[PDB]
Scaffold this active site. Structure first.
Site, short mmCIF file in Angstrom:
data_model
loop_
_atom_site.label_atom_id
_atom_site.label_comp_id
_atom_site.label_asym_id
_atom_site.label_seq_id
_atom_site.Cartn_x
_atom_site.Cartn_y
_atom_site.Cartn_z
N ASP A 126 0.78 -1.24 0.00
CA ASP A 126 0.00 0.00 0.00
C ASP A 126 0.82 1.30 0.00
O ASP A 126 0.26 2.39 0.03
CB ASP A 126 -1.05 0.02 1.12
CG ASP A 126 -0.43 0.06 2.49
OD1 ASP A 126 0.81 0.12 2.57
OD2 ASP A 126 -1.18 0.07 3.48
N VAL A 128 2.91 2.20 2.48
CA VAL A 128 3.22 2.59 3.86
C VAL A 128 3.93 1.43 4.56
O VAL A 128 3.61 0.27 4.29
CB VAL A 128 1.94 2.95 4.62
CG1 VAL A 128 2.23 3.29 6.08
CG2 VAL A 128 1.23 4.12 3.93
N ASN A 153 16.55 1.66 -10.10
CA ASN A 153 16.48 3.11 -10.16
C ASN A 153 17.39 3.42 -11.34
O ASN A 153 18.55 3.85 -11.20
CB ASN A 153 17.15 3.56 -8.84
CG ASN A 153 17.17 5.05 -8.61
OD1 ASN A 153 16.44 5.82 -9.23
ND2 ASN A 153 18.01 5.48 -7.65
N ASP A 155 16.57 5.77 -13.84
CA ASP A 155 16.46 7.11 -14.40
C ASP A 155 17.69 7.93 -13.99
O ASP A 155 18.66 7.36 -13.51
CB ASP A 155 15.14 7.76 -13.99
CG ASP A 155 15.05 8.04 -12.50
OD1 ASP A 155 15.81 7.44 -11.70
OD2 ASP A 155 14.19 8.86 -12.13
N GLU A 157 18.72 11.65 -12.01
CA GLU A 157 18.29 12.87 -11.33
C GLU A 157 19.14 14.05 -11.75
O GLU A 157 18.66 15.19 -11.86
CB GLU A 157 18.36 12.72 -9.80
CG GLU A 157 17.60 11.54 -9.22
CD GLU A 157 16.14 11.48 -9.66
OE1 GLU A 157 15.55 12.54 -9.96
OE2 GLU A 157 15.59 10.37 -9.69
N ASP A 168 26.16 3.90 -9.66
CA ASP A 168 27.14 4.18 -8.62
C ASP A 168 26.63 3.82 -7.22
O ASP A 168 25.56 3.23 -7.07
CB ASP A 168 27.59 5.65 -8.68
CG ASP A 168 26.48 6.63 -8.29
OD1 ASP A 168 25.39 6.21 -7.87
OD2 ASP A 168 26.72 7.86 -8.41
N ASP A 344 13.39 1.94 -34.42
CA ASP A 344 14.20 0.72 -34.41
C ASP A 344 15.09 0.50 -33.18
O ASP A 344 15.37 -0.63 -32.80
CB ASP A 344 15.02 0.60 -35.68
CG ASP A 344 14.16 0.30 -36.88
OD1 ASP A 344 13.04 -0.23 -36.69
OD2 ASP A 344 14.59 0.59 -38.00
N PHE A 399 14.26 -3.03 -32.72
CA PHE A 399 13.00 -3.11 -31.99
C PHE A 399 11.76 -2.86 -32.85
O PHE A 399 10.64 -2.86 -32.35
CB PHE A 399 13.04 -2.25 -30.71
CG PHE A 399 13.97 -2.80 -29.66
CD1 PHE A 399 14.49 -1.98 -28.68
CD2 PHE A 399 14.33 -4.14 -29.67
CE1 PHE A 399 15.35 -2.49 -27.71
CE2 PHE A 399 15.19 -4.66 -28.71
CZ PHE A 399 15.70 -3.82 -27.73
N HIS A 462 11.36 -7.62 -39.58
CA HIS A 462 10.66 -7.12 -38.40
C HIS A 462 9.17 -7.43 -38.41
O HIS A 462 8.51 -7.27 -39.45
CB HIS A 462 10.81 -5.61 -38.30
CG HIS A 462 12.23 -5.14 -38.20
ND1 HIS A 462 12.59 -3.82 -38.32
CD2 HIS A 462 13.38 -5.83 -37.98
CE1 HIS A 462 13.90 -3.71 -38.19
NE2 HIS A 462 14.40 -4.91 -37.98
N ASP A 464 6.92 -5.58 -37.34
CA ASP A 464 6.15 -4.37 -37.64
C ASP A 464 5.98 -4.16 -39.15
O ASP A 464 5.23 -3.29 -39.60
CB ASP A 464 6.70 -3.12 -36.92
CG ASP A 464 7.96 -2.53 -37.55
OD1 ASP A 464 8.53 -3.10 -38.50
OD2 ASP A 464 8.41 -1.47 -37.06
N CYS A 638 11.65 7.70 -41.99
CA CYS A 638 11.21 8.40 -40.79
C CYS A 638 10.88 7.35 -39.77
O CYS A 638 10.74 6.17 -40.08
CB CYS A 638 9.95 9.22 -41.07
SG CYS A 638 10.08 10.35 -42.43
CA LIG Z 1 2.06 -1.27 3.83
CA LIG Z 2 23.21 6.89 -7.44
CA LIG Z 3 13.15 9.75 -10.23
CA LIG Z 4 16.35 8.10 -9.53
#
Ligand SMILES: [Ca+2]
Ligand SMILES: [Ca+2]
Ligand SMILES: [Ca+2]
Ligand SMILES: [Ca+2]
Ligand SMILES: [Ca+2]
Ligand SMILES: [Ca+2]
Ligand SMILES: [Ca+2]
Ligand SMILES: [Ca+2]
Lengths: 659, 659
Positions: A126, A128, A153, A155, A157, A168, A344, A399, A462, A464, A638
């Site tokens: 949930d 929490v 993780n 992505d 920042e 890292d 692709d 792809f 492919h 596609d 394209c």
């Molecule tokens: Ca919980």
């Molecule tokens: Ca890091």
């Molecule tokens: Ca983030």
């Molecule tokens: Ca992050």
């Protein structure tokens, strides 16, 4: 409660930490003087003591006079329900008696410090962190399932860093913590642990490249982030604070499920006891939590569009104008880069946990002949990145060769996230196949249960090139769209019968004019007819596997006219632009402009496709990407890719087949 | 039935093989002349034809006059229930009509040859190969589960060959076939397959080192065995015989489940169609069976003894005499080799399939310092062999460090085959641990769900130094036996109190006489007391994990007196022979003779152990393996291992936890 063995000591009194949620079985016999006969006991108010003789237990008062015969089979069971404070004296004392006389001849004692230690995670999913979920050490699938979830993780920042956050051991900004799962070590006890004990968090060497764990300190000059478990850090000695205390940790995943990695990782806390120098510390108590790392999930064409990514030349104006127009009929945003790589080299997918989720790009493998370098340019805050590196990659690793179906039900088994589709060759063919490293990755995500199709009859190879999916407006249903050479030949034969055989293909493409391609010229080419009969056999083989593996009937399928030309390898390339590879934004379809034969100044292919699709409520916009090049050789210049909202269905509610 | 696409051809008639269990959906529109309006059809008696318009189906007579409008959405469904014979003409013919007139303007036709093709295995696990089990392509656990089972054929039929049967691609004798699972390719059809088709059996490259498949030919000069699938043979073209035919194949497993191999393998048959030169053949139909390779299963002490293997010096007479005596009270056979290797280097286990099972030896890893060469000398007919090769092995890789519990129930979860127990060190200790390759192997068998204990406090480091299991006669129950230093100290203190402190250890061992070890001397050694208190902490830590992981209470445990001495590494070696490592033949126990203090001319340790065990109906024989050596330094010079009957419970009826 778990039972733990603690014996009184012949001679010396015994001092021990007691962890709540356990209880002690206590040998009082070994500590007795030889020739002692009976024993009695006293205990303090917060210590509950039973005398157990051969399995039968009797509760004993704090200060009684009762005696029992000394026997190895007569023992104590000792239980505490509340942690010790500074004002606590928690103890049990045993007196020994000989045959003659009622005054004790000796005494042995057990001095106890009770503490609570629990490593807690959000196992009930949930968002929490609940107190000591009884199921926190397991992970089960489904609506009734439990156990905590972790995002890779992946992505970024902070823009100046080249790589994903998880590459890292450092955390630069508080924003990063929002991608992480919380884990709280909750304790209760007196001011200090008794001499010779310490609390230690730890992970296995195997999991050390799967996770990292951070703790936030707030020293004088600002907030800082300490890496306490992860790469090259297998344990951390915890600083103990008395009273009721909580230490909050943040956990990141470093690696997606893959071949040889299920996605499950564990973190432990132990109370260790110091024995002597040059001897390992003893794990008196251990508590464990499990995390499952969330899979990469691909989004099918039926999911709501958010952003339309487009790559073309600066000067292909008709394409840009028409794509802009199409996207303006929707609420989508258009992103343009001034070349098929966005189509692709990139597959749009997402990850989700109860506390957070974001889109994640899968980046196609580099060969070194064509693609030397990875594409990281989309890597950013809440836009993640993952890739796999094989040797030797072929066109089937692109792809364009990776698709995913809408949710389907097959033989009563539901696939609520759809199924991934990958083009391949027949088992005994010796043909091309997507690299094992990528196939293994997709299989390991498990929730999209991939199916291999037959793409190797195409030059580029492919899926596609021959198939796509569209939603049916106003319903929960969808259609499979299939390229059909039989539909094209039937249409052209009808137009010829109607007196249109001299109608010309490729009108307005100046580099094709000298060829003067007509319906008549196409229909009278006998070798081209045989080639396309063969390609239809290839399409129909795929049609059958799709019907089987997606649970589809003929009512779920629409055939769009297509035509191909064979190369030296007996593989197919498009004769005119493949209409099946289309931009699907809900009811609105951007369809490659075919440049088919004009009849009454309308392309007969456009009119035919409209007659198939429009009755279903689908709106067709034909998009010309080839006029800027003056000719069509079978190549597309394209690319587009659509970033979509994730499924409403939570992946953890699925129950994938046992492996 | 699976639906398959077959279109009539504009111009040419179409000839196709039809596989029973499928059906065809047939496009008649593409074959029509342009401007044809309606169609009619005829068909033969064994071909069932429906006309399907937009999902609605109508059965059609063999010779009718009925017509339907030509539409792409009006198609045929074609179904056959019986194979073609030589007298068959199976066909469907379609006539086309234009607007003006009722005489056909053209005709297209579909000529059909129906065949049955089924690859069959004993999926219902009764030892007989049933016809086309609907579940044959899956494998499920449990009483209600299905799918076929395969033994690793790890025994040796032919003595002059050095290695196990499965190490090559050849079968020398008919006896070998009895270890193999049967797989029958059943077909029905006319004299020959139509031109351009062939039937091919195949496996994946990945499975090619997991299986081999043989076919038995009976040519003029005798029976021969042909290797048709396996190492470096991925496919076999099948010779087709008409009428109802069966081809019997025999399948062997080459490899046990392991890290990275689940134990599941697949075999396929396809009907392939020839298209043209330089083009792959098309898989028109494919049928698949799955096998699971049977796990190696260890036998606990509670299973009925068959053979007692013994290794000692030729001249240790007391040992041989006493072991002979013990085995003579049973129905067991005694096998003697004239050195603990039979105990340390060998773990007795078994494999089982519905059609056959045999004992299988697991051979301990070679270090190269001590064990240079594997022990294959037990390899023989229906006695199999398996081993794993790690680097760097330690004493914890010895199979004295490998034990298995009786069947147990833990937190409501049943372990009907018991659980394997392996000695280890604490996670953060940096201590010794059994090699990963062996641990991974045991985990992969899955049905014995291994548990790691703490053995690294012992110099040698084996679980058999501190614990064993015995059945309780006349019941279905068992006891855990634990070494106890506390029991030894209590006994010696009692004897001292009784006036026996001058009683001497090791009576009759001449090489110990000068030491004059007495109860008094033992009890007055303060450092030895502290060492043994510490070793009891080590035993009790194990006691707790055994109670937890085996679901045991104190009522299930008996403590046998033991004493240890500490080395430089703070590790334990036996002070007097460890009685817990005993030969268990049902009610009869061979127990190492302790050479304890004599009181009234009986060893007080022997008398104490008898007083613990005999009331339960266990009969104790003390076996002296040390007198021949004149002294005891903590080393054991003999070994035994008992080969037992397998569990009655079938492993495939278990439901192991999801991985
Ligand atoms: Ca919980
Ligand atoms: Ca890091
Ligand atoms: Ca983030
Ligand atoms: Ca992050
Ligand atoms: Ca059967
Ligand atoms: Ca062989
Ligand atoms: Ca054999
Ligand atoms: Ca055999």
């Amino acid at each position: 409660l778990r039972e733990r063995t603690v014996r009184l000591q012949y001679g010396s009194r015994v001092e021990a930490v007691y962890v709540l949620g356990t209880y002690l079985w206590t040998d009082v016999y070994s500590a007795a003087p030889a020739g002692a006969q009976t024993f009695s006991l006293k205990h303090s108010e917060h210590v509950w003591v039973e005398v157990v003789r051969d399995g039968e237990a009797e509760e004993v008062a704090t200060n009684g006079k009762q005696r029992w015969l000394l026997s190895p089979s007569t023992t104590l069971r000792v239980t505490m329900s509340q942690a010790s404070t500074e004002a606590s004296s928690d103890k049990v004392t045993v007196n020994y008696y000989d045959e003659e006389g009622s005054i004790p001849i000796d005494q042995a004692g057990l001095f106890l410090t009770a503490i609570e230690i629990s490593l807690d995670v959000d196992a009930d999913r949930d968002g929490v962190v609940e107190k000591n979920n009884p199921k926190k050490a397991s992970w089960t699938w489904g609506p009734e399932g439990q156990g905590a979830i972790l995002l890779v993780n992946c992505d970024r920042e902070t823009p100046w860093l080249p790589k994903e956050d998880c590459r890292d051991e450092k955390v630069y900004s508080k924003e990063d913590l929002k991608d992480m799962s919380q884990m709280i070590l909750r304790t209760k006890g007196p001011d200090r642990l008794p001499a010779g004990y310490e609390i230690v968090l730890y992970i296995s060497m195997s999991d050390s490249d799967k996770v990292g764990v951070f703790y936030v300190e707030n020293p004088f000059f600002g907030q800082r982030y300490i890496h306490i478990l992860g790469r090259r850090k297998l344990y951390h000695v915890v600083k103990y604070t008395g009273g009721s205390a909580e230490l909050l940790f943040f956990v990141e995943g470093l690696c997606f499920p893959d071949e040889g990695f299920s996605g499950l990782v564990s973190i432990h806390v132990s109370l260790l006891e110091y024995m002597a120098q040059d001897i390992p510390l003893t794990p008196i108590f251990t508590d464990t939590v499990i995390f499952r790392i969330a899979p990469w999930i691909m989004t099918p064409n039926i999911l709501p569009p958010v952003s339309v990514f487009v790559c073309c030349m600066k000067d292909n104006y008709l394409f840009l104008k028409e794509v802009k127009n199409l996207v303006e009929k929707t609420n989508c945003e258009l992103k343009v880069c001034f070349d098929r790589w966005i189509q692709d080299e990139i597959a749009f997918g997402y990850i989700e946990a109860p506390h957070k989720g974001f889109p994640v790009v899968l980046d196609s493998p580099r060969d070194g002949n064509l693609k030397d370098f990875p594409v990281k340019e989309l890597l950013g805050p809440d836009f993640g990145y993952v890739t796999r590196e094989p040797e030797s990659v072929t066109s089937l690793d692109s792809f364009g060769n990776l698709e995913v179906s809408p949710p389907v039900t097959v033989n009563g088994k539901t696939y609520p996230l759809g199924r991934i589709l990958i083009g391949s060759s027949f088992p005994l063919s010796g043909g091309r196949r997507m690299t094992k490293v990528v196939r293994d990755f997709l299989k390991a995500q498990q929730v999209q249960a991939p199916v291999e199709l037959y793409s190797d009859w195409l030059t580029v190879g492919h899926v596609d090139e021959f198939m796509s999916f569209v939603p049916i407006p106003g319903t929960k249903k969808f259609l499979l769209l299939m390229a059909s050479t039989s539909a094209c030949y039937k249409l052209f034969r009808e137009k010829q019968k109607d007196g249109h055989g001299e109608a010309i293909m490729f009108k307005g493409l100046g580099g094709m004019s000298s060829k003067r391609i007509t319906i008549n010229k196409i229909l009278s080419n006998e070798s081209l007819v045989q080639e396309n009969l063969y390609f239809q056999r290839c399409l129909d083989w795929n049609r059958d596997i799709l019907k089987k593996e997606l649970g589809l009937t003929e009512q779920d399928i629409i055939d769009l006219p297509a035509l191909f030309k064979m190369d030296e390898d007996h593989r197919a390339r498009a004769f005119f632009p493949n209409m099946v590879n289309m931009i699907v934004l809900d009811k609105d379809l951007g369809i490659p402009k075919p440049f088919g034969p004009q009849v009454e100044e309308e392309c007969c292919l456009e009119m035919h496709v409209r007659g198939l699709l429009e009755p279903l409520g689908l709106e067709c916009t034909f998009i010309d990407d080839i006029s800027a090049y003056h000719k069509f050789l079978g190549e597309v210049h394209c690319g587009t890719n659509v970033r979509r909202k994730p499924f409403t269905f939570k992946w953890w509610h699925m129950v994938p087949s046992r492996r």
